[PDB]
Every structure is written in C-alpha cells, then in structure tokens.
Symmetry: D2
C-alpha cells in the first residue's frame, strides 16, 4: 500500500467525525475537532477533505463565530496542505427540512433551502472546491398521496437550475453533482438511482454543468450492479465525483469501509476507475472520495484504522486489477469470450438498414443453430478474475 | 365493472397463452390456438391484442406457412374487431440469443438480431400497431468482466438508432418503447430501471421517436416506487406504453394479475393514469396493457378468470380513485398537507438568485424553528386514501 | 368502527412517544409525558399500555426520582383503568450495549445486562403484566469474524434460561416472548426470523415458558410472508404476543401504521387472528399490540391520528375478513380449491408405509397425467378475497 | 490446489447435467449421459455423485429400461470408484406436482408423492447413500388464501415422519436432510429458512434422524448471513449435509459456482467448515456438495471448467482461512476484540439469579459509562481477515 497525495484520496469531515447515533442509540464517541481531523487525515496520506456547511459551521453560529471557525480551519489546511475538492450543504438534519429542502410542500422552506444553497456556493468558490454535491435525502415521501409527483420534479429542477445559473453568473469554476439514493431517511427518495439522476439532468436548462455523484452502497440498496451504473454515468460523461464504501445487501445504508461489502464488485469498480474500458473510451480522473462511517463499537483507534483501511483496500484492489488485465492468459480468455469483438460496429462502414435487411447471409441464409454453439467461456473468464483477486495468479 | 372496448384494455398472446414451464418444471396446459385467443379475448371485452413475432410465427416456419398463419390471424381480427396496438420481437428464447441480441459479444448474432427487428418493424406497420416494444432480456451478464460496459451501450445505441432511422425512412407511424428490467433472465440486465432507460434515450440520434414501456413488477424487483417511476417517465413525456401486473416483493418476476401484488401501489398507479397530477400537467392516454401469466396450478377456466380479473381490478381501483379525489374531505386534507402549495414556484415572477439571496426574510431573518412546527398531516391523508380504497368512505 | 377495551388494542409508550430522531436528523416533536400518554390512549379506546424500563425510568434516575415517576404512572393507570399487559427492557440505547447485552463479547457488560433484566422482571410482576418481551437488537455483528457463533448462542441461552428460572422460582405468571429481527441496528442480528426464534427455544432448559413476539415489519425486511410465519408460531403453540405495524419493502424498518404497508398481507393476518385456520387449530388470544412510529413530518395532532388509524385499520380489515369467510361463494371456491381437502390425513386409519407402497392405486397404477388436470382455481379464490377487501362484495 | 477424494467434493447429476432451459429460453446444451458424468467427475477429483430419481430413471421408464440404466450407472461407479453419498426425489417437475407433493391440496397426489418417496428410500439404501434430502419446492403458494396453513404443516409432518418411520423399520443407515428455500418456484415456500426447518424438526415424531441441508444461495435470497444460519444448525447438532453455490443478491436463484457470488461470506463459511468455532464446538464432517448450474452461455468445455472452478474456489479459500487463523497477529486481534471472552459463561460457578441481582459490582455500582469505553476494534479484525483473503498477508 502506502497512500500518498497523488492517489487523490479525499474523505468527508462527517465520516471520521460520525459519533455513533443510529436509530436505536446515542453516540459512543466524543465530537471530533475539525482541526484534529485535518491534521490526522494529512498524516495518513489523504489529499483533501470535504464537508457539509453545518459539519464546520453550526446552524445558529453568529457571523463572528463563522469567521473564527473558518480562520482556524483555513490555517490547518495551510499547515498541512489538504485541498478542499468538494463542498456540500446539509438540507436534512434540522427539523425544518422534515419534508425536504427544494421539494418541501411548504413554499417558505423551499426558499430558505435554496438561499442556504446559494450562500454555500459562495463558500465553495472561496475554498477552491471544483465540485458542489447535492444529496436530496429528505426529498420524497412515505405515502404515495403526499406529493404531486410532477410538481416535485418541477421544484427539484427550479432549485438546481437556480443554483447552476448562479454558478455561471458569478463565473465560479464549479460543477454540481447530484447524489441518488433509493430510500432512508425517506420511505422513497426522488431520483432514486443513477439512471433517474442521469435522466433528470437532461430536462434541466443548465444541464451542461450538472453531473452525478453515485455512491456504492446506495445503488446496492436497490440490488443494482454498481459497476454497470458508473459505466453508464461514465459513458454519458456525467461521472463528476464518486463516493466509495461497503454495503452487505438490501438493508439500511451501512456505510462500511470500501471493500468490506461486496468484495468482487469493489474489485471491478476499481478496474473501471483505474483501467477504464477494454476497447478504450472514457476514464474517470477525479478524486477517490470515501463516504463511510466507522462502526460504533470501536473507539478512535478504530476511527483512524478505518480511514487507513479505505486507502489500503483501494491500493490492494488496484494492484490486483493491474495484474489481472496485464496477464496474457486474461487477454487471451477475453479474446475468446468476445470482449474485443463487442467493440466492432454491427454494421459495415456505409451499410444502411436497407442493405443489412436484404443481405441474405445476415438473416435468410444465417445458421442460427450453428451460431448458437459458440462457447463464450464466461465462467472461465470469471474464474481468472477471482484467482487474480485472491492473489493466486 | 364490465370492461368495454373504449377502456383500451390490451393483452399479449403470450400471457393467456403461457403454458406453465418455469425453472423447476414443464407446461401444465396445452398450447393456446391464436384464433381461439382472439375470439376469447374479444368476448371478454378487450380492445386489442399484442404479440411477439414467434408467438404467432414459428422461428423456422417457411414463407408459405407465415402467410397461412397471418391469413387466419387477420380474418379473426376482422371477425372480432380487435386492433393490434403493439408488436414486439423475441430476442431471447432461441439458444442463439444466449448472450443477447443487439449486445451479443458475437458480431454475427448482433446482425441477425437487428435484421430480425427490421423485418418485424415491417410486419408492425402492416398490422397497424402505433408502438413497437423492445425488451432486451438477454442483454447483460452474470459476471462483471464478461463485457466492455461502454461497448455494450454503443452496440445498444446502434441497434435502436438503426431501427428508428428505418421507421423514419419508411415513414411508418410507429414509436419505439424500451422496456427496462433489472435481472432475470440475465444476472444483471442493461438499462435496469425507468431512469436508466430514460437516461439512455437522451444519447440517441433518433431519440424523438423513442420512449419507455415500464412494467409494474420490473421496478418492484429493485424495490422502487412504481408510481414514482411512471410519474418521472410521464413528466419527461416518455411514457409511450405501459405493462400492468403484480409482484409480491424482491424475488423472481411473478407476473401476477394487476392488483394481486402491492395493492395500495396499484391504487395510486390507477389514480396517476386516470386522474393525472393534482395541480395539472401530463396525462397518459395510451392503452392499458396487461403483461402477466396465469398461475400454473389452474386450468383454462383459470386462464379466462385471470384475464377477466385484470380488467375487474383496474375498474374497481379506478372507481375508488375517482371517489377519493372527488371527496371534499380529501381535497381539504390535500390543502392542509401542501399538495397544491408544491405547485407554486419557489421564486416570485422575475426574482433572480441574487434577489432571493439578499431577501432577509427568506434566509437571515427566517424562523426555521417556527417553520419546523407545521403539522403536514401525511398520516391522516394516507388514512383517507386507504379508507377510500377499502370502500369504507 | 370504534374501538373498545374488548378489542385488546395495546400501545407502547415509545410508539406515540417517538420524537422523530432518525439517522439523518434530530427530534421534530417534544417529549411526551407518560401521564398524558395514558390518558390520551384511554380516550382513544386503548386497552393497555406497554413500556421499556427506560421509557419510564431514566437510566440514571435516583431512588426518589423513580418513586415519583412510578407514583404518577400508577395514578394515571388507576384513574383511566388502563392495563399493563407487557413490559420489556432497553438493552440497546446506552453506549454500554454497543456489542449487545446478553451476547456482548465483554463479560462484565453481559452481567450488567442480565442484572438489568432480573430487576425488570420484578417491576413487570409489580405492574400486573402477563408477558415479558426480549428483543436483542444489539445481539449480532457487522463483520463475520467478530463473534464465535456457537458461543454467541450459549451466551443467549444462559441469559434467557437464567431469566426463566428466576420467574419460576419467584412464582410470577410471566412468560418470555422472544422477538426476531434480521438486521438494524446490527448488520446481522442473532435469531433473525420466526423460524430462528422457534428453533432456539427448543434448545432451552426452560422453553415451556418461552415463546415468540413476531413483528410484521421485521419478517417483511427479509421478504418473508408474515402470515406464514405466525401460522408456524401458532401451529407450535408458541405465539405469546404479536407486534403489528407496516413496512413497504426490504429496506430500513419503517414502523408505519398497521395496514399502511402491505395491505393484502395485513388483510390475511387479520383473517388468521380473527377467523383462525379453515380446518380448525389453535387460535391467538392476546393483545393486538401496535409497535409503530408516527412519521416525523406530523405534529402531535398527527400522533393521535396515527394511534387512531392503527385500531381503525384493524377494525376495517376485521369487518372485511369476517364477511369474506361468511360468504357462501367464498366457501364454494375454498372447497373447489381443496382447502378443506388439505385437512384430511394422507394415510388411511392404521395404514403403514409398507401398506402404502404396496397399494397399486396409490403408486404403481396411479394416473399422474389424469390427476395433473385438476384446475385448483387459486386465481379465482384470490380475486374473491381481494373484492371482499375492497368492499365491492 | 488439486482436489483429491479426501476432500469429499460431491456433485449432483443435474448440476453439470443442467441443459440451459430457463423461464425465457430453451436448452443450449445437449443431454449429458450419466455414464460420462461419472467418468468426467472422477477424472476431475470428485469424491461422489448424487442424483434425483428422475435425473437417472425417466418418470415413465419401463422395468427393462430401469434395469439397463441402473446397470450402466453401477458399472460406471464400479469402474471409477465414485461413491453415492446422497439421493433425493423429484417432487417438482411433473405437472402432477403443481401444488406440491406432500402438501398438495389433493389427497391422491399427496399419496402418490409419499409412495414415490418410499420407493426412493429403497433405491437410496441400495446405492450406499448416508443421506436422503427432501427439498419441497412446490410446497407453498402464490396467494394467501390458497392454503390452510396449520393443515399444510401437519401434512408435511405426516409425510416426513412416515418416511422416517419406514427408515427405522427397514434398518437403513439413512438420515433425512430437509432443505429450505424462501421462494422459487412458488411465490412463498413452506419452511423458508434454516430457522424454519430446525423449528419444524422439533415437532416431529422421529426428528432424531431428521436434520438440515442448507444451501448458500437459498439463505441469501432472503438476505440472511449463511454462515450465521449454518452456525445455528451446527450448534443444534443438525447440520447433516450442505449445498454450496453462489448468489449475487436478492433475486431469482442463480446457482453460480461456489465463490462466484458473495466472496467474503464464502471465505467465512469455509473458515467455519474447516476451522470450526474459535472456542471449540461441534464440527461439520460430511460431503462438501456443490448444487450449481454451469451458465447457459458456455458450451461443454465450460461445464467441466465450472465443475473444476467449484473445487478450486473451495481449495483457495481453505488455504487462506487456514493461514488467517494461524497468524499470530490475527490471534492477538481476536483476544483484543473479546472473541475468546464470549466463551466464558456469564455467571460464576454455582451463582444464581438471586446471587447476581444482589451482586453490587454487577449492577448497583457498575460503571456503565466506563465499560462503554472499550474499543472492540472489529474494523481492524475485519481488515486483517480481508487481507488474508486477498493473499497480501
Ligand atoms: O447517505 C448520505 C449521503 O451519502 C451523504 O453523506 C451525501 O453524500 C453528502 O450529503
Ligand atoms: O419479462 C418479460 C417482459 O415483460 C416481456 O414480456 C416484454 O414485455 C415483451 O417482450
Ligand atoms: O425494532 C425495534 C423493536 O421492534 C422494539 O420496539 C421491541 O419490540 C422492544 O424492544
Ligand atoms: O432450488 C433447487 C434445489 O436446490 C434442489 O436442487 C434440491 O437440492 C434437490 O431437489
Ligand atoms: Mn454519499
Ligand atoms: Mn412486459
Ligand atoms: Mn417490536
Ligand atoms: Mn440444493
């Protein structure tokens, strides 16, 4: 292992600072001072730190307090060298956001949320973040008649397009990244998956600077393939940031260390981020952000062990995924299964629909029964990836 | 109840004709003659019938046979009055489609699938279908390294855009509707949910004539809100057709009668199709297609009981959903919860981001703690819908 | 439908008393005085109230404090006539319980946890409660190597048999009801389903007084059929108590009002509690206890609305289910489908294995293809059930 | 890693013999001759072969046919030395079994099904099998009013105790292993999890010879922790057999190769089979049986590849898991986390309930806040396990 700043491992303040309250209990750890957080994180080899406005600045802090806090915070950044690549707003903890921020049924709460957001964009630019994340965790319902579903999407669009237009208007060098989540804390959250989020951005006025911020555990809560989803975001060139962690199944969001959930899936996620696509195409070159929570049963030694482990797991997987693809036997297996064959167009240069239709060999004269005999050998190909993952090859 | 042709209840040939083979067994029913199907369906009050090419015409039938079959089939349509509103292709049963049609790793199979599709478009136009459905049931993988995820989406796009361009080129009065499915028969299917499908259409050249064909059970297999998903398709004006059925949970696709799965969700699905949105907007005016399978334990009396029941359940729900919304007490409850309030824009006519920012009452001077006291009364509102569903009000 | 004490509707102090804090937010409601809980629930028609030791008596309460609290609570009970049918212990909220009470890896904690249970038995006995519920919410793990699994079950057995022995020695008429849950708050909980709880009970030294407390939502979080699980608990004569609420799929425990989740399943559970088994069998006679949470979006008006909605949902389902079995057409359908035929023993009176293999009629010349022709007509029985539920019958 | 007969790797005839038909397609491979299955598996290192009565002997086979088939199979066994450790009955493929075998609503069917079982016991005994597996795949329902649930369990009990009584009377050394599954092919199956199977066994007249046959994928289809379920089966001394395969989430049963689904869970199951419980306890000694399906995309080369991959995955996991417990650092971490402390009984030798409530140290003056400070360090133990799995340690 041994992570270093050019690896671009970013961590949020709320991850290592998460104190332990869950639905059945109180915190098991004391609050983490943000200056300690920065120093500690930098010592471990992180590249940057991210935060939610209220992570650093209390909801009711006065203007004198906000500047006191920011002064010590900027100093620590300075002393250590951590950058601040992404900033986000808390539109979910305070009781006022019980029906949402942007999609609250109450008009006065929608304006308050939007004004909280606009102000936070200002702080984002001041910090030097390139990405502004929006997780609409309270946007949704428990009951189907609680909302007008068309109006909920018009109100979501108005807040995002207002925020986007503000970025363009002030000339900030910022992008917005929406973060899909299927449920928890709402029964049903709006824009529940990568596809929903991707679809939605296409209906925006300011779509051009809006992308996604997918989270491993969030797609796994719907039973989806995390690599399939990021592949699709990447293919559309909407993968602006990423949140890595672990999830063992369809249940509450667990927020384990990356690699402590679906291990084989993390392997392939790493292969896609590092190696890209077999035939060439898009690559994700942003930060590798870890959005997790250290288990409540463990003390602060566990908090820093857990932070260390996110980075270890990613470097271990990266190493095995480079060896995997570099292997002559894998490449050969790949060729046999048709991975490079999928890269060739179906139609010949210049062939029209008409042409293919009327080409006897592709249809009328085709031997479907002979084509059906092919051994794709996907089982052997899968076996080679696991032996590579197991450190056996 | 009593369904009648202006209700626009369509049924596929493979639903009532499904003979019973599942993974652990053989058919329990004899094959259903398609001419019987048409007559029977028409007697029950259906408006139309839909089919897959091989539902009617055998994969290896000769040209003399295809015309014999079509002749008797058109005659029955004539004798009864059923229309043929949608036609689709089978790109999944034959062993040649074991790795997909359009996204097969084998180039020769991709061409064969595409040529099967183009020919079937011709038959669609001849029949008078307005909709051409594409369910990519074999497109996906069991293993993550089996495919180049970027190349799988380029090949999906090439077949759909080739088919679309052919429709435009021949001037057919047809639309394509993609049908998302999360898994089964593949471990992971590409374009697994409504959002994924919606996102994908935005990357097409011929996007304008491409929409979706969502299926109740398919979104419920990912644990998603079926009404939330169709709301989003409708809002984007991509809801070109719909497949209704029942699903009891995250498991294999059960294909029960509509209403025999998540009852409350079917209620709200019916409310959206019939009533639309509370504040006004888009409406879905196409056919109400039932894509289900009669339980294998039951004989042919059960097949026609099951067909009858799809229509009964929809009319029962429709009736309760009209009463629900028409109710003065519901309207009042709706007002209290802010359903109409969500319909008002957040920003005042002419207000800019700048303006709202600097409006003291929406932020600096806002009383978050007082705004947080509001009783949304979503529980009472939910109670009124269930009493309406229960036939109590 | 108006509830009366005769109905045996019981509520937990923590249910209407639930304040609104979840994983991503703080409480939205103010604490509920116990005195007012008691009076308000008696005005609604409640039969009894239930509580956790620390719902009532703070963890740190002094002796003088405890006595005051008990004096006020016992006053309220005397004033209103409310009964206290069940009492439970809180072995999950304090940080001390982070790894469990009974199956903590730390022995001093295991000792404290059992001590806390014994003291609570006394209180339970003082209050007149018939049932003692044990829900081991922190018993389990996030990671597979965290626990010696054989030793976790011995620890659990030690605790439960100690508590049972103590009851027997003290002469108390108290029975222990164990309550399964698959996950939340731990990633995996010991004894996750009705099946695992019944099995464990059979390994106990004093299992005669140990039974189950199944919860609607809990079984549904693993995707099981709650009605099938309570039917196995009844069949074994081990259904000592029941917790009713609603869940809308495999996700975090929602704790919705009974009937606000899976409706048809709710209908069928009520049918089983009220009508019993079609061919006869044991019947459930305890409290109908609601363990739910008023959504955090609702103010106190909403709390009483939700309390009310629980009993109301139950009465509406009961009316429908009594009408359903009373219907001649439904009885006809039931006989046709073989529901009464399942009640006839397979073998003949004094027929042995040997006698049966040898019966020619049963095997050697049994006409399997002719038997396979029976139309079970389960679809039509299911349509009739649904129509009774919707009150269209 | 090269398997030897000493390993006890067993395979079902129906596993490598699975032809490829699924819900949306026909077979992709030709039928496998039994003779060749036997020889091929012996060349791979298999220990034994297992089968369903109709895997080998067709349902309609004549007497002369049966004898020929048996003569060829017994030849193969003699030639290769393969053992036949388990035999099972097919009570799910013929249409006669549409509503179940043992719990069919139709009594004549229930009689045929039991007859079919008794005859198979004889054959099982002739073959030298130790285990008789019962998987009741059609036992259950799609709809809640289809069955009298108390009567479904009595019918099940009748069948299983008749079969057990017959074994006892005949002097056969055969034990029955019941096999749970939550769903597929029925929407709900009776006795859906390890927990439900163990419970039911305790209600049996002859449960001394009745135990479990849990399957990896089956428990995971309900989202349970397979390793926790087999640990409860072991603890109760009821783990008679085991079926190993892979599942990638809550969906249709995939029947992937062991290790091709949840990897870390696979690692921990192997640890439990090979290392036993950390503080000692019963150990599993039977066949390591693989009940999987070679993906339908692969030709026969793929079939043998997959057979091989099963034993290989198992050997790789075994090597890793033996190295993991042998590691001094891992033992250190285990002691730190209290894994050995769980093994110490909570009470002192001859300490009663009364003695414990009264110990001041245990309750009255126990310092709960000081005890709550222990760092269990479960995260670091889990990181160490994963690093052993990836062979980076
Ligand atoms: O489940 C919560 C989300 O993962 C958030 O932490 C966003 O990433 C930041 O608001
Ligand atoms: O699960 C199968 C799909 O529902 C199909 O029936 C498509 O609708 C028609 O190809
Ligand atoms: O999931 C939480 C449980 O349902 C509890 O409320 C128990 O019933 C009692 O501790
Ligand atoms: O889900 C199918 C089952 O796993 C069977 O293969 C049984 O093991 C034997 O009938
Ligand atoms: Mn996140
Ligand atoms: Mn469909
Ligand atoms: Mn409960
Ligand atoms: Mn099996």
């Amino acid at each position: 292992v041994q992570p270093t700043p050019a690896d671009h491992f970013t961590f949020g303040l709320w991850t290592v600072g998460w104190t332990g309250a869950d639905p059945f209990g109180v915190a098991t750890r004391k609050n983490l001072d943000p200056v300690e957080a920065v120093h500690k994180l930098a010592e471990l080899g992180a590249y940057g730190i991210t935060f939610h406005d209220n992570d650093l600045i209390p909801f009711d802090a006065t203007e004198a307090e906000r500047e006191k806090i920011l002064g010590d915070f900027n100093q620590a950044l300075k002393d250590t060298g951590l950058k601040v690549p992404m900033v986000t707003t808390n539109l979910f903890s305070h009781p006022v956001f019980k029906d949402g921020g942007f999609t609250s049924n109450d008009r006065s709460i929608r304006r308050f949320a939007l004004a909280k957001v606009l102000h936070n964009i200002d702080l984002a630019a001041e910090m030097g973040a390139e990405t502004f994340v929006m997780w609409g965790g309270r946007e949704g319902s428990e009951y189907d008649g609680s909302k007008d579903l068309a109006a909920a999407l018009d109100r979501m669009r108005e807040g995002v397009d207002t925020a986007a237009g503000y970025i363009k208007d002030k000339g900030y060098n910022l992008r917005i990244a929406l973060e899909p989540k299927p449920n928890e804390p709402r029964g049903d959250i709006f824009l529940p998956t990568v596809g929903h989020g991707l679809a939605f951005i296409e209906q925006l006025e300011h779509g051009d600077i809006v992308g996604l911020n997918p989270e491993t555990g969030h797609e796994q809560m719907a039973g989806l393939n995390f690599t399939h989803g990021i592949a699709q975001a990447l293919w559309a060139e909407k993968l602006f940031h990423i949140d890595l962690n672990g999830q063992r199944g369809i249940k509450y969001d667990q927020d384990l260390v990356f690699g402590h959930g679906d291990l084989t899936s993390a392997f392939f996620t790493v292969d896609l981020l590092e190696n890209g696509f077999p035939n060439g195409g898009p690559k994700y070159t942003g930060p590798r952000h870890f959005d997790y929570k250290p288990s409540r049963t463990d003390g602060y030694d566990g908090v820093w062990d857990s932070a260390k482990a996110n980075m270890s797991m990613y470097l271990l997987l990266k190493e095995r995924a480079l060896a995997f693809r570099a292997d002559p036997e894998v490449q050969e297996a790949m060729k046999t299964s048709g991975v490079f064959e999928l890269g060739e167009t179906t139609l010949n240069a210049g062939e029209s629909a008409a042409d293919l239709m009327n080409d006897s060999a592709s249809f009328a004269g085709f031997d479907a029964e002979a084509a059906a005999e092919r051994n794709f050998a996907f089982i052997r190909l899968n076996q080679l990836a696991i032996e590579h993952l197991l450190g056996s090859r």
